[PDB]
């Protein structure tokens, strides 16, 4: 029993982190097989970031201008190319610690672990969600760029995020490992405002199921609702609309607990309208939306890697 | 910017986890050099746990009755001994992945990372505090016993916790790696009640400093207080007494922010008396007490391992 915001074990990804330096800029790279992936703004000064022309800045760069260090050992760069907002540095040595891996582009509401790194060295690991406005609320200092987000399926790492930018509002933006930003963000130091950070309703319901499984049941009420009724209330509280696809995904948690998804929706509606009245659920005074239904099943069933 | 509940990177500890089976009981062990450390209740059935005589149960056990598996490879047990509430299984192979390590017995209020494991395989990593009543609020299912808690200092793992018991109230108890329980708990399935779970005041103040460093400043007020005044209010809200030793530990965060420790105490006193009024600090609706002053400095300065 107990329920914790849990990250994936980080060792498979620790084995892939390297340091990339171009001129005076140092950040992190991801070494898989004989390629190192890093943010293309490794080639920029802070001055360049105000209005960078990446193709033009890259013309002035050769393989030998990209310094890649793995532990305290220097890798030889034998090619480089830009793909969207990432650089791919081809090295002459395959990473011997390369795990089974995939590159995945996640949906808003999906969760992942971040291995925060500086100078190619791991600092810490924590669990993130992709917000509905395509930001993440991370913990990233200068030099964290190139840190990655991932999920593990037994022995296979699905890389879904690479860190590129802090917005002026202190939330975080980045790319998939093909270098496409999540959301409308660009790798330029310019006015970029996030849209509405809505609550991930299907994740809140999953976490309420987690709370019931763990004996935190005070919030269960006598009511039910319909998807349309529930959604009118959700929209008012800046919660994402719940779809039948979400109801279907919550089916196994419904089955375990014997609480119909719409009954849990009616419990959530009352919590939105009445608040917590100074009470907690799974030690939280807010409704938690950083656990997917898959996360809750996984943690409640003790799945290993 | 941003501030997250962050675990240490887990790879150095992943390299040490093994499966230990005695008869029908399987749980986790920690393989360091040529010793595997595990809970002595590996030798108990659920029936035995009602009133176990560990010396008597151990007489019936030989080296060959302890099955130790590291990945899918079987280790040879060449000796066994009981130290307090842990077994030490001597194996004929030193773990090749043994990190630099120490065994430390932590104080209440100190934080650590847990690598939750089942059948010797990592499931997840999360950050814990040792509560003032010597419990932890973890996420542990049947078969998680022998999972460990740790801190890292650059390349050195300080092991501070091994998981043994879930209390009837669903909080967790365990030992240091010399097998001494934290608190008065025993490895028997009997009535064990935790004392008052007080709030770790020095950690709350550290986290308020973290909030200021990150621009969450609404709760800063016009007041100061004294240690004695503050403590009268703390005692009323089941907060731990703040000592001059705690004030001294918060000195560097005081210096960074320019907020005197007693001024922050007066901000905290007003938050206790007035509540949050539906506002949040670093995305929390509760005052967070799972970050030590060392944690806050570490995360705010980007320390790596």
From Swiss-Prot, chains A, B:
The active site is at 41 (for 3cl-pro activity), 145 (nucleophile). It catalyses: TSAVLQ-|-SGFRK-NH2 and SGVTFQ-|-GKFKK the two peptides corresponding to the two self-cleavage sites of the SARS 3C-like proteinase are the two most reactive peptide substrates. The enzyme exhibits a strong preference for substrates containing Gln at P1 position and Leu at P2 position. Changing residue 145 to A: Complete loss of 3C-like proteinase nsp5 cleavage. It comes from the Viruses. Residues 1-305 are cytoplasmic. There is a cross-link at residues 5, 90 (Glycyl lysine isopeptide (Lys-Gly) (interchain with G-Cter in ubiquitin)). It is found in: Host cytoplasm; Host Golgi apparatus; Host nucleus. Changing residue 90 to R: In strain: Beta/B.1.351. Inhibited by pyridone-containing alpha-ketoamides compounds 13a and 13b. In turn, alpha-ketoamide 13b (tert-butyl (1-((S)-1-(((S)-4-(benzylamino)-3,4-dioxo-1-((S)-2-oxopyrrolidin-3-yl)butan-2-yl)amino)-3-cyclopropyl-1-oxopropan-2-yl)-2-oxo-1,2-dihydropyridin-3-yl)carbamate) inhibits SARS-CoV-2 replication in human lung cells. Inhibited ex vivo by michael acceptor inhibitor N3. Inhibited ex vivo by compound 11a and 11b. Residues 1-305 form the Peptidase C30 domain. 3CL-PRO exists as monomer and homodimer. Only the homodimer shows catalytic activity. Interacts with host FBXO22; this interaction promotes the proteasomal degradation of nsp5. Cleaves the C-terminus of replicase polyprotein at 11 sites. Recognizes substrates containing the core sequence [ILMVF]-Q-|-[SGACN]. Cleaves and inactivates human TRMT1, preventing tRNA guanine(26)-dimethylation of tRNAs. May cleave human NLRP1 in lung epithelial cells, thereby activating the NLRP1 inflammasome pathway. May cleave human GSDMD, triggering alternative GSDME-mediated epithelial cell death upon activation of the NLRP1 inflammasome, which may enhance the release interleukins 1B, 6, 16 and 18. Also able to bind an ADP-ribose-1''-phosphate (ADRP). This is 3C-like proteinase nsp5. It comes from Severe acute respiratory syndrome coronavirus 2. The lineage of its organism: Viruses, Riboviria, Orthornavirae, Pisuviricota, Pisoniviricetes. The gene is rep. The chain holds residues 3264 to 3568 of 7096 of the full protein.
């Amino acid at each position: 029993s107990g329920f914790r915001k849990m990250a994936f074990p980080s060792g498979k990804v620790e084995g892939c982190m390297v340091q990339v330096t171009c001129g005076t800029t140092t950040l992190n790279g991801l070494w898989l097989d004989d390629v190192v992936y890093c943010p293309r703004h490794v080639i920029c000064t802070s001055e360049d970031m105000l209005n960078p022309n990446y193709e033009d800045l890259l013309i002035r760069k050769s393989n030998h201008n990209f310094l890649v260090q793995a532990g305290n050992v220097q890798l030889r760069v034998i090619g480089h190319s830009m793909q969207n907002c990432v650089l791919k540095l081809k090295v002459d040595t395959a990473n011997p610690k390369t795990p089974k891996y995939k590159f995945v582009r996640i949906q808003p509401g999906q969760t992942f672990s971040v291995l925060a790194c500086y100078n190619g060295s791991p600092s810490g690991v924590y669990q993130c969600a992709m917000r509905p406005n395509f930001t993440i609320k991370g913990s990233f200092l200068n030099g964290s760029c190139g840190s990655v987000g991932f999920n593990i399926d037994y022995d296979c790492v699905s890389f879904c995020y690479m860190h590129h930018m802090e917005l002026p509002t202190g939330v975080h933006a980045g790319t998939d490992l093909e270098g496409n930003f999540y959301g409308p963000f660009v790798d330029r130091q310019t006015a970029q405002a996030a849209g509405t950070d809505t609550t991930i309703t299907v994740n809140v319901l999953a976490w309420l199921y987690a709370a019931v499984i763990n004996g935190d049941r005070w919030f269960l009420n006598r009511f039910t609702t319909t998807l349309n009724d529930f959604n009118l209330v959700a929209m008012k509280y800046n919660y994402e609309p719940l779809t039948q696809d979400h109801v279907d995904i919550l089916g196994p948690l419904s089955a375990q607990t014997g609480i119909a998804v719409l009954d849990m929706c009616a419990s959530l509606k009352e919590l939105l309208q009445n608040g917590m009245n100074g009470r907690t659920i799974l030690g939280s005074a807010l409704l938690e939306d950083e656990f997917t239904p898959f996360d809750v099943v996984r943690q409640c069933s003790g799945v290993t890697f």
